Structures are given as structure tokens and as C-alpha cells.
Design a protein around this ligand. Structure first.
Ligand SMILES: CO/N=C(\C(=O)N[C@H](C(=O)O)[C@@H]1N=C(C(=O)O)[C@@H](COC(N)=O)CS1)c1ccco1
Ligand SMILES: CO/N=C(\C(=O)N[C@H](C(=O)O)[C@@H]1N=C(C(=O)O)[C@@H](COC(N)=O)CS1)c1ccco1
Ligand SMILES: [Zn+2]
Ligand SMILES: [Zn+2]
Ligand SMILES: [Zn+2]
Ligand SMILES: [Zn+2]
Lengths: 237, 240
């Protein structure tokens, strides 16, 4: 029962929760227990593509991330080819060593990799770079299957990236996008308050077709999460 | 100040040092203070300040002594009347972290007897006086001398076993502290010390104690309607 909830359609597995979102897409949820404060949920994705599994974001810790891999073994039983992690904070990159130990190739924005050690994180093995329009440079993201990686500009952090899943209704905003009933934008300590609104809108325009918006700290929402996030961010300028 | 958890600043609000103050009624203000958690950001906590004639009454400290001293400095600047007493609403840091600042200022402090018994087990300082309660939750009046408009009610165990609540007589405001979450809340906050069996009934008991309060003030979000009480209770129904 995190401080920052479980419903029908959720599967507990060890200390994590999994929810199927589409025939080949699942949301993973893990929890950080903070002394005196309680547990904080964070969400990522698991995608089955062409006999392999692709992961978006680690859990908060190496042990929780190893639990993700065990769930994948039990439920899907296909090799995990790669992971994409969406910025250099613990909720997204806390489990990199578990991925590396398992032989999984890891990818992050070059800037995330540069920030990683300064943020307490292990860097990904490979760096993604981006065009001026935000789209990933194709040669840096080989064999990504249906994953469409987009850098929307600075927002929650300067390095935040986002991921659409081609052939589905799903796009993943990570910690950039907050839900349509949110009171705030979460932790703004590392945020770019000038550019945030434009970055939220750029995410929406990059994935114009996605009706299910997945994000780190709330359940999947409509495109109203994008609109609402942008309007909250307009107030920061 | 843009806390990670808690309401944001809006029109009305006064920034004073590290805190924010919002007038809720001619004689009632909300104080807000912030705890920075490394890697997570700031967490807001709210209490109340009430003017009762020629004296001021406080509900809850800030997270720290220094923040609580700042509350007292705001009261001196904006109201310029003495603080007669403070009521603190359970033995967690957000509500009792600043007891030493109140004691240094010479302010009489009151808490549930249970909160005073628990405070030292959390490394905190007990209030100097103990409130006790009837079987229906109303404070025993002899334990709450000269409380003016503060009507203290123990609704039963919920967020904690000791949590108390305060209606402000002569207004349409009631304070639920950390028992009550806002009408759009996704969770009941920290349940580490909570009574999941009794929470829903306790939330409803608070609503029934102050049935004509239309403005519900709470620790970690902006003042809300009575939908905060009903939503809290509905979330708590799921815990049993
Ligand atoms: C380096 O990252 N360390 C983190 C961490 O991952 N914090 C993130 C952050 O602050 O952005 C989490 N993300 C958040 C967000 O708005 O995306 C909020 C929730 C706070 S917790 C941390 C340390 C302690 C608790 O969380
Ligand atoms: C002794 O209390 N120590 C606290 C503390 O006051 N925590 C409180 C609590 O957890 O109940 C706050 N209150 C909360 C609540 O649901 O009322 C949530 C917000 C977590 S922060 C603490 C340590 C670090 C952050 O909060
Ligand atoms: Zn982050
Ligand atoms: Zn986050
Ligand atoms: Zn508490
Ligand atoms: Zn609290």
C-alpha cells in the first residue's frame, strides 16, 4: 500500500506488481520504502517483440530488477534482448547492475549516462543520441523492434526520454508526464521550468496516435495527462 | 517553493522565510512548512493559526524547531498577539517536530495523552499537558482549559492510533490533520502506523463530529470540501 495502488488486473510477484496493457505489453511496478515516509511506486514497461523481450526502465534496486527478470522468465520465457532507461534517477536506473549481470544490453540518452555517476547510478552500456527534432539517431538504437525513442526536450530533468510502442495504443512518458488529476508535477528539483511545457507538448505531438499514456508514478491515463501536465507546466514560466 | 508532495502556491499565499501562510477566514490561517528529503524533494505539512480575541491558538508545529520559530515570528509580525497554547495532533514529526520552539517561547502545549506517551518512542518531545477523551471521542473539557474555539475530537484509530482532530467553533472549518486526505487522493499516505481495520469508521466519525464544517483542512493538501472526508472513508473501506 504505497504512500505515493493495487487493483483488479494486477498480479503480485514477489515485491512487484505486473499489469498487462496489451497482448505484448506489460507494466512493471516496484516500490521504494523510505524510512518514516513509506513506499513510493514507480512504473516501467515490458514488451514482447519477435521472440525477445525489451524492457523500459529498471526497478528502484538491483534486487527488484532481478525480480522483474524472474517474472519475465516465468510468464514469458523468452530472452531479454535490451533495456532502454529513461533518465538518470533511481526509479529508472537503480537496477542497472542486475541487467548487466544478466547479459542484457542497456541503452540510455548519452546525457543520462554522463549524469549517472553524479546521480548515484551505474551508466548504461550504450548511449542514444538525438536529432534536433527529438527523434533518436537510428544507428544508436539498433534492433529496437517496435520501440520508438523520442527526446522531447528538458522537463522533469534535462535528460528525460520517452518511448512509443509501434503497433499499439501505448506511449510511455516516464517521469515527464503526470496524470490528469495530479496536483503537481512531482519532484521539480532537477527540472527545467522554462522548457517543461514545450517538452510535454512535444511528447504529445511525437506520439499523436497513442491513447494510453503510461507514466512512472500513476496508473495509465488518457491523453488528458499530456494536456494537464503541459498546463501545469505553463504555470512555471 | 514547489514541493514534491503537498499543495503548490496559489493566489492569496504569503511566503515568509521558508514557510507559506494562507488566510482561510478572518481569524484563521493555515501554516505550511516543508521537509526536504534528499533525492525526493520537499514534503508540505499544514497546521492552523486561530485568533481568539486578544490571543492566538496554534494547531500543530512545523517539521522542525527552526520552522516552528518562523511560525511564531509570522504571528508576531502579522497579528502581534500572544500565543496562548498549541494543540498537536499526533506523535509524528510533521505535527510535533517543533515542540522545543514552542516550549522555548513559553507556550503551553497539549496533545492526546497517547501522543505524549508515544512521542519519546519517536525521539520527540511530549507536550506539557495531556488531553483525554470520552468513549464517543469528545475531549474531556477539564483537560482542555480555555481552548476558546478549538473543539478537539478523537475520532478513533486511523492514520495512527493517537490521531486527533479539531473543529474551529464559530467557523465552518474543521481540521482533520493526517487522518484526512484530499478528495482526489490516490492513497491514504503513510499507513505504516495506521489501523486499517478501524480507519474508515474513524474518518466517518470525524465527519459526523463536525457535520456542518464545509472547509476541511488537512496536513498534506490544500483545504477541501467534505468530499475529502467521504473519499478518505471510501479509500479506507478497501483496507478492511
Ligand atoms: C537519484 O534519484 N533518487 C531518487 C529518485 O529516483 N527520485 C525521483 C525524483 O526525485 O525525480 C522519484 N521521482 C519522482 C518524480 O516526480 O518522477 C518523485 C515522485 C520523487 S521520487 C530518490 C532518492 C530517494 C528517494 O527517491
Ligand atoms: C516521526 O515521523 N517521521 C516522519 C513523519 O512525520 N512522517 C509522516 C508520516 O510518515 O506519517 C508524514 N505524513 C504523511 C501522512 O500520510 O500523513 C506522509 C505524507 C509521509 S510524511 C518522517 C520522517 C521522514 C519523513 O517523514
Ligand atoms: Zn526523475
Ligand atoms: Zn520519477
Ligand atoms: Zn503521521
Ligand atoms: Zn502527516
Amino acid at each position: 500500500r504505497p504512500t505515493i495502488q493495487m487493483e483488479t488486473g494486477d498480479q503480485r510477484f514477489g515485491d512487484l506488481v505486473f499489469r498487462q496493457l496489451a497482448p505484448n505489453v506489460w507494466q512493471h511496478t516496484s516500490y521504494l520504502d523510505m524510512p518514516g515516509f513509506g513506499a513510493v511506486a514507480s512504473n516501467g514497461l515490458i514488451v514482447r517483440d519477435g521472440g525477445r523481450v525489451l524492457v523500459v526502465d529498471t526497478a528502484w534496486t538491483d534486487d527488484q530488477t532481478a525480480q522483474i527478470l524472474n517474472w519475465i522468465k516465468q510468464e514469458i520465457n523468452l530472452p531479454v534482448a535490451l533495456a532502454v532507461v529513461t533518465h538518470a534517477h533511481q526509479d529508472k536506473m537503480g537496477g542497472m547492475d542486475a541487467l548487466h549481470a544478466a547479459g542484457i544490453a542497456t541503452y540510455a540518452n548519452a546525457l543520462s549516462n554522463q549524469l549517472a555517476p553524479q546521480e548515484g547510478m551505474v551508466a548504461a552500456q550504450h548511449s542514444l543520441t538525438f536529432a534536433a527534432n527529438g527523434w533518436v539517431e537510428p544507428a544508436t538504437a539498433p534492433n529496437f523492434g517496435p520501440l520508438k525513442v523520442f527526446y522531447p526536450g528538458p522537463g522533469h530533468t534535462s535528460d528525460n526520454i520517452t518511448v512509443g510502442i509501434d503497433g499499439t495504443d501505448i506511449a510511455f512518458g516516464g517521469c515527464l508526464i503526470k496524470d490528469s488529476k495530479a496536483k503537481s508535477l512531482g519532484n521539480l528539483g532537477d527540472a527545467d521550468t522554462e522548457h517543461y511545457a514545450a517538452s510535454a507538448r512535444a511528447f504529445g505531438a511525437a506520439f499523436p496516435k497513442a491513447s494510453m499514456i503510461v507514466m512512472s508514478h500513476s496508473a495509465p491515463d488518457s491523453r488528458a495527462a499530456i494536456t494537464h501536465t503541459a498546463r501545469m507546466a505553463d504555470k512555471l514560466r
